[PDB]
Amino acid sequence: RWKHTSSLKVANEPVLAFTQGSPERDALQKALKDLKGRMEAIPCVVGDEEVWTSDVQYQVSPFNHGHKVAKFCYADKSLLNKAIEAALAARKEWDLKPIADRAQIFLKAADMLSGPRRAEILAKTMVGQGKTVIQAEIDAAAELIDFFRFNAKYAVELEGQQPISVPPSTNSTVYRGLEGFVAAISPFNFTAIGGNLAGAPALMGNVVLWKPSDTAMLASYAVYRILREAGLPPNIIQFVPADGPLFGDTVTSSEHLCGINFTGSVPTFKHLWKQVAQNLDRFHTFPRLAGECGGKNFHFVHRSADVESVVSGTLRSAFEYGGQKCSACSRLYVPHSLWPQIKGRLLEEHSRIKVGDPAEDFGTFFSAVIDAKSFARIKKWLEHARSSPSLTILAGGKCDDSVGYFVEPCIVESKDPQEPIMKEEIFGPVLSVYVYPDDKYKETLQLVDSTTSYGLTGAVFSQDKDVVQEATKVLRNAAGNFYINDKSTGSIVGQQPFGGARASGTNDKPGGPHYILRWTSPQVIKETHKPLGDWSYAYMQ
Amino acid sequence: RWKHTSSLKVANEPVLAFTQGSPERDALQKALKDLKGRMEAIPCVVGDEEVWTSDVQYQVSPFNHGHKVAKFCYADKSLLNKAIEAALAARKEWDLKPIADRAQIFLKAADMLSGPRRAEILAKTMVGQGKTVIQAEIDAAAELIDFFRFNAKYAVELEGQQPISVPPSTNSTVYRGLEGFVAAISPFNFTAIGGNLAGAPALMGNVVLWKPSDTAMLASYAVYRILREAGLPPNIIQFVPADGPLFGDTVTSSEHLCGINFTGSVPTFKHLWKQVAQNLDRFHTFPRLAGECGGKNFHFVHRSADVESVVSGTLRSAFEYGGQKCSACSRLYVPHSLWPQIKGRLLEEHSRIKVGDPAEDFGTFFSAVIDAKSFARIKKWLEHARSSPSLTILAGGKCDDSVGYFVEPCIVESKDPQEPIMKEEIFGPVLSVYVYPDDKYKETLQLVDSTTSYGLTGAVFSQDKDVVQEATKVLRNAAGNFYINDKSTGSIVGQQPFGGARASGTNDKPGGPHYILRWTSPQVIKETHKPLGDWSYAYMQ
């Protein structure tokens, strides 16, 4: 008879400017002060019970590692299984709750983050992960808010995708959550990513065990508390920080695992994938694994490029948040003709880059890298840049962990386009440059595509429109997010759905309309309204 | 700016009635005669080269196993690798061809199947797989034609799903095929399924190695030849029958595997999944595995049911095409109050069921089972139905493999609702019945949900509208295709997208608008039209 169908008008959350005297800048400075010298105690949360184990851990401020910003603990096997059992017992009612009621919780949480809780969530991201004002703002506010709103819009509008009905039967599709629990494993670099890893599956009718990154615990728990206050029922998302391997071992051993939503390193993702496969016989259904892993991303420059855009775009992409983004540019390809100009502008602007404490000094461009293990790995690369004959440091190269894990932005030139530093992901502020002969730009395009294992992000700078069209074809699979005359970072929800293939992951494109499909197992229902009839057919009579 | 876009309106293929004197019935009888006593020689096809190996195999007519209907051969490791290398070299140009041009091939193949080639494809399915006229019609014509048309509509309209653009940038999504080759492994029971397993990925810009079922070779190759004549370029689909394990071992060993599209048994699917995981390190990207496996499907009857619909619906579901459908009903739950009436009507109608040669006698309801291995397995079940104390054969129980693999439709009553015959998939014409006490119908609903490992199809017969709403809730995850007062078979494309979870597979819903998404890896492109600006931010001044 009738089909009734609902839509949702959503806009991207406006990014505030935070200038002198603005209300948001005053709010944020009060939120920062309310944090200096205080250490939050963060329990595991299972259902509504706050739980503590004997395995206490601390989260320290990256630019001042003497300040413990949070104290939390690791779930044991016992607690993780209690969490699984309780999540499973809450699932059927949650899955049965209409998508509009579920969406409403995430819309309210988005509004809480947008206004009243904004400064708090910005402040905890700045202090706990080492983000500057603007990095915390585009992440912990804008992207997280946009995930909640746009995924709610997409889930609501998915209900309207219904099959054809033909008399005497009516057909309908019911978007079921996966049967079991989902494990969400989030990384340090984005506060928004934890929110979406656990949030998107929960929105789609799943129950979730969320293991947040130890180095983002302060802000992750702030996200969790907001969702609970926005109305998320108990046992829909369990907050269970844990040792990585123990968590991985436990959830891939449960017969009830129906999914893993992972962001982080390729080896850890492959390992989880292998564990699930080793145990395939015990699962009640086939577990869905989604993985967003790293990249070795590029800015490729043609002789026609606008040099100023190349310069500011590459500095932002390589060095914002210390180059600690899956999308950060770490290999730059420059034509011989343009190199002297670009090298000079880069070196001049590099010298103007202030690294320091992002809460005390808002003039800070970027701050310390996240932790000691990261700091060490980066120093070994710096030492490798001096040691290697094919490599010379053009700028930076110093690092100082006496107060925070501080690394100077570093620019390295490579004479060898296949050097390990052009291929392996550093996750620090280290930009590698290869200068190529103008006459050999077509072959250098092939090098970009062929050099690494990754296919996450990439950019082309060219004013020549025919060269753009050409590189677009050649690099089709070298980057899941491809940028033309823009930096390789800063994907905005609903505008650049994000992810890539090759070794960079399963490319489910969070931030787009199709991402949520991974988290539903649709049922089709056919109802027939008239009596069936003879089992024989006419052609048989 | 502005773009030229397009959409596709399509309609289901009408199912012909094939009555005396109708044009389709005369065409089909000529096509059957043109097949009696002839044996088609079927090569492997790599690119455009017909290739023969020393490993010759035969396909025989199931109802007359003395008639060899086709002679074909198995690809060796060598040929499979030649086929991989050649597919890969054809991929980029094919992926780059616009979706409208690729869709056009499948639309033309659908029209060929619909008219000129219909009788031929029906006839080869009847003769090679043992299908009756109407089973061949709803499968090799209607469903296959619908897959081609509806997937083409869905792929064309997917292009229209584009992200938000905000000045000074324009965003676009490019639906890339997977990078590598896809392996398509099809089963005997549906001719349409081979078409879609290899056809849907190819449509989305992939290159495919198709291993067709040895027992469906005649009709599968007829589908393949039609696609090629409709315009499919060489090396987009390689026709490569092979030994199952050798094929599985070869493709899971190629660094270039990017997907497996599988239909068949759970254990073979799990095995492929484990092989892919064991080899994760070698692949250039993460292979997507889609699996449609079996079911142990139910018809549940409430005391309010229309008895005639239950009877004809159950007979059709259990016994059409010999009960060799992933969706066939093989467990029936009946209330004590209704049993005498239903048992009597069933037994009466059972006695009117004609089993025989479907080409010589159109009065045949169903024919022989597919092959000797299947025939044996089914006999072992029949012997189990006598032997078991909990089990008594109410009807049929004879089988005769002297001329074809003929099994009488069999009805077994179980006193034990957890008996192996209520749980394990037979893939033959064997219906198990459990009679339950009316007062215990709520708990019996739970038994349906809890008894097996599968979640494929299921049906509820009830005139009581409140009982329907209740069973719908209780059984939400017991069936991916759920039927209310209709048989548990006969999913029509675009009306009941088909598949289920639990052990029944990955539930990607072929026949729906989302299935094709498994076969694309989207790229987002952002172009910025104005110069970038300072790398510093205002708040930093």
PDB file of C-alpha atoms in Angstrom, chain A residues 17-19 25 91 95-96 132-135 150 158 161 163-164 166 169 171 174-176 179 266 269-270 273-274 276-278 280-281 284-288 306 309 312-313 315-316 320 349 352-353 362-365 453 461 472 475-477 479-487 494-497 501-503 505-509 513-514 517-518 521-528 531-540, chain B residues 12 17-19 25 91 95-96 132-135 150 158 161 163-164 166 169 171 174-176 179 266 269-270 273-274 277-278 280-281 284-288 306 309 312-313 315-316 320 349 352-353 362-365 453 461 472-473 475-477 479-487 494-497 501-503 505-507 509 513-514 517-518 521-528 531-540:
ATOM      1  CA  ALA A  17      38.777  29.773  15.218  1.00  0.00           C
ATOM      2  CA  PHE A  18      39.860  30.176  18.866  1.00  0.00           C
ATOM      3  CA  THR A  19      41.191  33.732  18.435  1.00  0.00           C
ATOM      4  CA  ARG A  25      39.266  30.242  23.680  1.00  0.00           C
ATOM      5  CA  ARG A  91      21.862  -7.305  23.002  1.00  0.00           C
ATOM      6  CA  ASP A  95      18.964  -4.717  18.591  1.00  0.00           C
ATOM      7  CA  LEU A  96      15.138  -4.572  18.786  1.00  0.00           C
ATOM      8  CA  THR A 132      47.574  21.581  19.777  1.00  0.00           C
ATOM      9  CA  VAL A 133      44.353  23.572  19.998  1.00  0.00           C
ATOM     10  CA  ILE A 134      43.464  23.215  16.308  1.00  0.00           C
ATOM     11  CA  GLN A 135      44.345  19.509  16.081  1.00  0.00           C
ATOM     12  CA  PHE A 150      26.357  11.515   9.833  1.00  0.00           C
ATOM     13  CA  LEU A 158      19.153   2.902   5.292  1.00  0.00           C
ATOM     14  CA  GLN A 161      16.057   0.950   1.351  1.00  0.00           C
ATOM     15  CA  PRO A 163      12.720  -4.390  -1.524  1.00  0.00           C
ATOM     16  CA  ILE A 164      10.018  -4.536  -4.215  1.00  0.00           C
ATOM     17  CA  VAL A 166       4.413  -7.838  -5.525  1.00  0.00           C
ATOM     18  CA  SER A 169       3.090 -10.664  -0.996  1.00  0.00           C
ATOM     19  CA  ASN A 171       8.509  -7.726   1.348  1.00  0.00           C
ATOM     20  CA  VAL A 174      15.091  -5.620   8.670  1.00  0.00           C
ATOM     21  CA  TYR A 175      18.603  -4.338   9.423  1.00  0.00           C
ATOM     22  CA  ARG A 176      19.730  -6.640  12.240  1.00  0.00           C
ATOM     23  CA  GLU A 179      24.665 -11.777  16.428  1.00  0.00           C
ATOM     24  CA  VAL A 266      49.240  -3.817  10.057  1.00  0.00           C
ATOM     25  CA  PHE A 269      45.636  -6.530  12.498  1.00  0.00           C
ATOM     26  CA  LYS A 270      47.088  -9.509  10.557  1.00  0.00           C
ATOM     27  CA  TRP A 273      42.923 -12.030  11.530  1.00  0.00           C
ATOM     28  CA  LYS A 274      45.050 -15.170  11.888  1.00  0.00           C
ATOM     29  CA  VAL A 276      40.152 -15.618  14.225  1.00  0.00           C
ATOM     30  CA  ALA A 277      40.938 -18.005  11.352  1.00  0.00           C
ATOM     31  CA  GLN A 278      42.665 -20.506  13.650  1.00  0.00           C
ATOM     32  CA  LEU A 280      36.877 -20.439  12.883  1.00  0.00           C
ATOM     33  CA  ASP A 281      35.213 -23.714  14.000  1.00  0.00           C
ATOM     34  CA  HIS A 284      28.564 -19.246  15.902  1.00  0.00           C
ATOM     35  CA  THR A 285      28.932 -17.042  12.846  1.00  0.00           C
ATOM     36  CA  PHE A 286      31.736 -15.704  10.653  1.00  0.00           C
ATOM     37  CA  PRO A 287      33.395 -12.712  12.382  1.00  0.00           C
ATOM     38  CA  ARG A 288      33.684  -9.503  10.389  1.00  0.00           C
ATOM     39  CA  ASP A 306      52.183  26.499  -7.229  1.00  0.00           C
ATOM     40  CA  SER A 309      50.849  25.731  -1.825  1.00  0.00           C
ATOM     41  CA  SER A 312      52.590  25.160   3.245  1.00  0.00           C
ATOM     42  CA  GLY A 313      50.624  22.063   2.329  1.00  0.00           C
ATOM     43  CA  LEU A 315      54.682  21.392   6.095  1.00  0.00           C
ATOM     44  CA  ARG A 316      51.184  20.955   7.511  1.00  0.00           C
ATOM     45  CA  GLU A 320      51.079  18.724  12.165  1.00  0.00           C
ATOM     46  CA  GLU A 349      59.703  28.122   6.905  1.00  0.00           C
ATOM     47  CA  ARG A 352      59.967  29.400  11.945  1.00  0.00           C
ATOM     48  CA  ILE A 353      58.301  26.231  13.339  1.00  0.00           C
ATOM     49  CA  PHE A 362      49.251  28.530  21.781  1.00  0.00           C
ATOM     50  CA  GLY A 363      51.951  29.614  19.336  1.00  0.00           C
ATOM     51  CA  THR A 364      53.030  25.976  19.295  1.00  0.00           C
ATOM     52  CA  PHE A 365      52.647  24.383  15.858  1.00  0.00           C
ATOM     53  CA  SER A 453      53.151  -1.575   0.318  1.00  0.00           C
ATOM     54  CA  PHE A 461      50.470  19.391  -7.090  1.00  0.00           C
ATOM     55  CA  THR A 472      44.975  10.423 -11.366  1.00  0.00           C
ATOM     56  CA  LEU A 475      47.927   6.524  -9.063  1.00  0.00           C
ATOM     57  CA  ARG A 476      44.390   5.120  -8.966  1.00  0.00           C
ATOM     58  CA  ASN A 477      45.380   2.439  -6.454  1.00  0.00           C
ATOM     59  CA  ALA A 479      45.832   6.202  -2.581  1.00  0.00           C
ATOM     60  CA  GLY A 480      42.319   5.610  -1.230  1.00  0.00           C
ATOM     61  CA  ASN A 481      42.190   9.326  -0.452  1.00  0.00           C
ATOM     62  CA  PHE A 482      43.685  11.278  -3.290  1.00  0.00           C
ATOM     63  CA  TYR A 483      44.167  15.011  -3.228  1.00  0.00           C
ATOM     64  CA  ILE A 484      44.694  17.425  -6.120  1.00  0.00           C
ATOM     65  CA  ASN A 485      46.496  20.598  -5.067  1.00  0.00           C
ATOM     66  CA  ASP A 486      45.845  19.968  -1.378  1.00  0.00           C
ATOM     67  CA  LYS A 487      47.607  18.343   1.568  1.00  0.00           C
ATOM     68  CA  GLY A 494      30.724  13.274   4.633  1.00  0.00           C
ATOM     69  CA  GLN A 495      33.192  15.036   2.329  1.00  0.00           C
ATOM     70  CA  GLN A 496      36.220  12.735   2.162  1.00  0.00           C
ATOM     71  CA  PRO A 497      35.200   9.278   3.435  1.00  0.00           C
ATOM     72  CA  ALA A 501      43.492  -0.586   0.281  1.00  0.00           C
ATOM     73  CA  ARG A 502      46.741  -2.483  -0.294  1.00  0.00           C
ATOM     74  CA  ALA A 503      48.459  -2.936   3.088  1.00  0.00           C
ATOM     75  CA  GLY A 505      43.551  -1.982   5.417  1.00  0.00           C
ATOM     76  CA  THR A 506      40.138  -3.247   4.404  1.00  0.00           C
ATOM     77  CA  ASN A 507      38.964   0.177   3.107  1.00  0.00           C
ATOM     78  CA  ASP A 508      35.465   0.276   4.573  1.00  0.00           C
ATOM     79  CA  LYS A 509      35.439   4.106   4.274  1.00  0.00           C
ATOM     80  CA  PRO A 513      27.250   6.126   3.781  1.00  0.00           C
ATOM     81  CA  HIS A 514      28.399   2.519   3.282  1.00  0.00           C
ATOM     82  CA  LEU A 517      26.734  -1.806   6.301  1.00  0.00           C
ATOM     83  CA  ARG A 518      29.622  -3.815   7.750  1.00  0.00           C
ATOM     84  CA  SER A 521      23.274  -8.531   8.903  1.00  0.00           C
ATOM     85  CA  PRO A 522      20.003  -7.839   7.039  1.00  0.00           C
ATOM     86  CA  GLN A 523      16.983 -10.157   7.238  1.00  0.00           C
ATOM     87  CA  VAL A 524      14.375 -10.202   4.488  1.00  0.00           C
ATOM     88  CA  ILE A 525      10.783 -10.942   5.443  1.00  0.00           C
ATOM     89  CA  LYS A 526       8.183 -12.031   2.909  1.00  0.00           C
ATOM     90  CA  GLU A 527       4.543 -12.169   4.010  1.00  0.00           C
ATOM     91  CA  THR A 528       1.975 -13.763   1.734  1.00  0.00           C
ATOM     92  CA  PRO A 531      -3.738 -18.970   0.393  1.00  0.00           C
ATOM     93  CA  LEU A 532      -1.050 -20.916  -1.477  1.00  0.00           C
ATOM     94  CA  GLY A 533      -2.758 -23.261  -3.967  1.00  0.00           C
ATOM     95  CA  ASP A 534      -1.946 -26.624  -5.531  1.00  0.00           C
ATOM     96  CA  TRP A 535       1.645 -27.823  -5.310  1.00  0.00           C
ATOM     97  CA  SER A 536       1.409 -28.990  -8.917  1.00  0.00           C
ATOM     98  CA  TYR A 537       1.999 -26.640 -11.868  1.00  0.00           C
ATOM     99  CA  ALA A 538      -0.230 -26.152 -14.948  1.00  0.00           C
ATOM    100  CA  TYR A 539       2.424 -27.212 -17.472  1.00  0.00           C
ATOM    101  CA  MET A 540       2.407 -30.597 -15.605  1.00  0.00           C
TER     102      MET A 540
ATOM    103  CA  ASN B  12      11.947  -8.758 -13.157  1.00  0.00           C
ATOM    104  CA  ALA B  17       3.950 -20.998 -17.954  1.00  0.00           C
ATOM    105  CA  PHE B  18       5.054 -23.577 -20.553  1.00  0.00           C
ATOM    106  CA  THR B  19       1.539 -24.966 -21.172  1.00  0.00           C
ATOM    107  CA  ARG B  25       7.130 -25.175 -24.661  1.00  0.00           C
ATOM    108  CA  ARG B  91      42.373  -5.516 -15.376  1.00  0.00           C
ATOM    109  CA  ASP B  95      38.455  -1.245 -14.288  1.00  0.00           C
ATOM    110  CA  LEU B  96      38.832   2.059 -16.193  1.00  0.00           C
ATOM    111  CA  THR B 132      12.296 -30.009 -14.212  1.00  0.00           C
ATOM    112  CA  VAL B 133      10.989 -27.436 -16.647  1.00  0.00           C
ATOM    113  CA  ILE B 134       9.799 -25.006 -13.975  1.00  0.00           C
ATOM    114  CA  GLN B 135      12.921 -25.345 -11.815  1.00  0.00           C
ATOM    115  CA  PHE B 150      19.360  -5.755 -11.202  1.00  0.00           C
ATOM    116  CA  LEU B 158      25.898   3.597  -7.017  1.00  0.00           C
ATOM    117  CA  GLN B 161      26.256   8.268  -4.363  1.00  0.00           C
ATOM    118  CA  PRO B 163      30.128  13.059  -1.224  1.00  0.00           C
ATOM    119  CA  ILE B 164      29.416  16.666  -0.201  1.00  0.00           C
ATOM    120  CA  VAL B 166      32.417  22.569  -0.140  1.00  0.00           C
ATOM    121  CA  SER B 169      37.031  22.074  -3.096  1.00  0.00           C
ATOM    122  CA  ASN B 171      34.835  15.900  -3.906  1.00  0.00           C
ATOM    123  CA  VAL B 174      35.412   6.622  -7.744  1.00  0.00           C
ATOM    124  CA  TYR B 175      34.187   3.027  -7.394  1.00  0.00           C
ATOM    125  CA  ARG B 176      37.339   1.028  -8.157  1.00  0.00           C
ATOM    126  CA  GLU B 179      43.234  -4.724  -7.056  1.00  0.00           C
ATOM    127  CA  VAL B 266      30.709 -24.763   5.181  1.00  0.00           C
ATOM    128  CA  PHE B 269      34.592 -22.278   2.857  1.00  0.00           C
ATOM    129  CA  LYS B 270      36.244 -22.412   6.307  1.00  0.00           C
ATOM    130  CA  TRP B 273      39.384 -18.860   4.827  1.00  0.00           C
ATOM    131  CA  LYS B 274      42.123 -20.602   6.836  1.00  0.00           C
ATOM    132  CA  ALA B 277      44.901 -16.362   6.682  1.00  0.00           C
ATOM    133  CA  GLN B 278      47.928 -18.721   6.717  1.00  0.00           C
ATOM    134  CA  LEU B 280      48.172 -13.198   4.765  1.00  0.00           C
ATOM    135  CA  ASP B 281      51.741 -11.866   4.583  1.00  0.00           C
ATOM    136  CA  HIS B 284      49.241  -7.206  -1.747  1.00  0.00           C
ATOM    137  CA  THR B 285      45.942  -6.395  -0.102  1.00  0.00           C
ATOM    138  CA  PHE B 286      43.492  -8.121   2.256  1.00  0.00           C
ATOM    139  CA  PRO B 287      41.372 -10.637   0.329  1.00  0.00           C
ATOM    140  CA  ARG B 288      37.623 -10.336   0.664  1.00  0.00           C
ATOM    141  CA  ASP B 306      -4.233 -22.918   7.014  1.00  0.00           C
ATOM    142  CA  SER B 309      -1.061 -23.985   2.503  1.00  0.00           C
ATOM    143  CA  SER B 312       1.432 -27.698  -0.511  1.00  0.00           C
ATOM    144  CA  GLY B 313       4.019 -25.224   0.713  1.00  0.00           C
ATOM    145  CA  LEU B 315       5.789 -30.409  -0.232  1.00  0.00           C
ATOM    146  CA  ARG B 316       7.192 -27.846  -2.644  1.00  0.00           C
ATOM    147  CA  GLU B 320      11.211 -29.582  -5.442  1.00  0.00           C
ATOM    148  CA  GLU B 349      -0.429 -35.987  -1.625  1.00  0.00           C
ATOM    149  CA  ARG B 352       0.581 -38.555  -6.064  1.00  0.00           C
ATOM    150  CA  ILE B 353       4.211 -37.331  -6.514  1.00  0.00           C
ATOM    151  CA  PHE B 362       6.778 -33.112 -18.086  1.00  0.00           C
ATOM    152  CA  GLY B 363       4.457 -34.576 -15.443  1.00  0.00           C
ATOM    153  CA  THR B 364       7.572 -35.179 -13.378  1.00  0.00           C
ATOM    154  CA  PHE B 365       7.565 -33.182 -10.144  1.00  0.00           C
ATOM    155  CA  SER B 453      24.098 -24.244  13.585  1.00  0.00           C
ATOM    156  CA  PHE B 461       2.409 -20.725   9.269  1.00  0.00           C
ATOM    157  CA  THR B 472       9.195 -13.044  14.169  1.00  0.00           C
ATOM    158  CA  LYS B 473      10.954 -11.684  17.273  1.00  0.00           C
ATOM    159  CA  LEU B 475      13.347 -16.318  15.288  1.00  0.00           C
ATOM    160  CA  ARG B 476      15.025 -13.035  14.240  1.00  0.00           C
ATOM    161  CA  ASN B 477      18.397 -14.752  13.865  1.00  0.00           C
ATOM    162  CA  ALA B 479      16.638 -17.229   9.343  1.00  0.00           C
ATOM    163  CA  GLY B 480      18.119 -14.584   7.034  1.00  0.00           C
ATOM    164  CA  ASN B 481      15.155 -15.199   4.754  1.00  0.00           C
ATOM    165  CA  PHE B 482      12.027 -15.492   6.814  1.00  0.00           C
ATOM    166  CA  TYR B 483       8.660 -16.368   5.349  1.00  0.00           C
ATOM    167  CA  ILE B 484       5.201 -15.812   6.825  1.00  0.00           C
ATOM    168  CA  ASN B 485       2.610 -18.206   5.391  1.00  0.00           C
ATOM    169  CA  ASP B 486       4.830 -19.146   2.459  1.00  0.00           C
ATOM    170  CA  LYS B 487       7.343 -21.830   1.589  1.00  0.00           C
ATOM    171  CA  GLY B 494      15.017  -7.547  -5.942  1.00  0.00           C
ATOM    172  CA  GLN B 495      12.187  -8.963  -3.830  1.00  0.00           C
ATOM    173  CA  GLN B 496      13.867 -11.348  -1.384  1.00  0.00           C
ATOM    174  CA  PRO B 497      17.625 -10.613  -1.369  1.00  0.00           C
ATOM    175  CA  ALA B 501      24.217 -15.693   9.000  1.00  0.00           C
ATOM    176  CA  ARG B 502      25.288 -18.142  11.694  1.00  0.00           C
ATOM    177  CA  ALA B 503      26.977 -21.078   9.954  1.00  0.00           C
ATOM    178  CA  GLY B 505      27.675 -17.799   5.578  1.00  0.00           C
ATOM    179  CA  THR B 506      28.740 -14.191   5.454  1.00  0.00           C
ATOM    180  CA  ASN B 507      25.255 -12.929   4.496  1.00  0.00           C
ATOM    181  CA  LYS B 509      22.609 -10.662   0.312  1.00  0.00           C
ATOM    182  CA  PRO B 513      21.447  -3.342  -3.692  1.00  0.00           C
ATOM    183  CA  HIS B 514      24.345  -3.781  -1.242  1.00  0.00           C
ATOM    184  CA  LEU B 517      29.713  -3.181  -2.489  1.00  0.00           C
ATOM    185  CA  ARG B 518      31.788  -6.194  -1.473  1.00  0.00           C
ATOM    186  CA  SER B 521      37.215  -0.502  -3.133  1.00  0.00           C
ATOM    187  CA  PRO B 522      36.179   3.184  -3.317  1.00  0.00           C
ATOM    188  CA  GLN B 523      38.627   6.011  -3.817  1.00  0.00           C
ATOM    189  CA  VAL B 524      37.753   9.574  -2.756  1.00  0.00           C
ATOM    190  CA  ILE B 525      39.215  12.432  -4.753  1.00  0.00           C
ATOM    191  CA  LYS B 526      39.337  16.002  -3.414  1.00  0.00           C
ATOM    192  CA  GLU B 527      40.332  18.742  -5.789  1.00  0.00           C
ATOM    193  CA  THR B 528      41.103  22.203  -4.407  1.00  0.00           C
ATOM    194  CA  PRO B 531      45.811  28.438  -3.528  1.00  0.00           C
ATOM    195  CA  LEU B 532      46.419  27.027  -0.034  1.00  0.00           C
ATOM    196  CA  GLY B 533      47.656  29.865   2.184  1.00  0.00           C
ATOM    197  CA  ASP B 534      49.916  30.142   5.220  1.00  0.00           C
ATOM    198  CA  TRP B 535      50.703  26.966   7.129  1.00  0.00           C
ATOM    199  CA  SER B 536      50.221  28.864  10.394  1.00  0.00           C
ATOM    200  CA  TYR B 537      46.799  29.364  11.995  1.00  0.00           C
ATOM    201  CA  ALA B 538      45.247  32.643  13.219  1.00  0.00           C
ATOM    202  CA  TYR B 539      44.838  31.491  16.831  1.00  0.00           C
ATOM    203  CA  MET B 540      48.641  31.049  16.813  1.00  0.00           C
TER     204      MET B 540
END
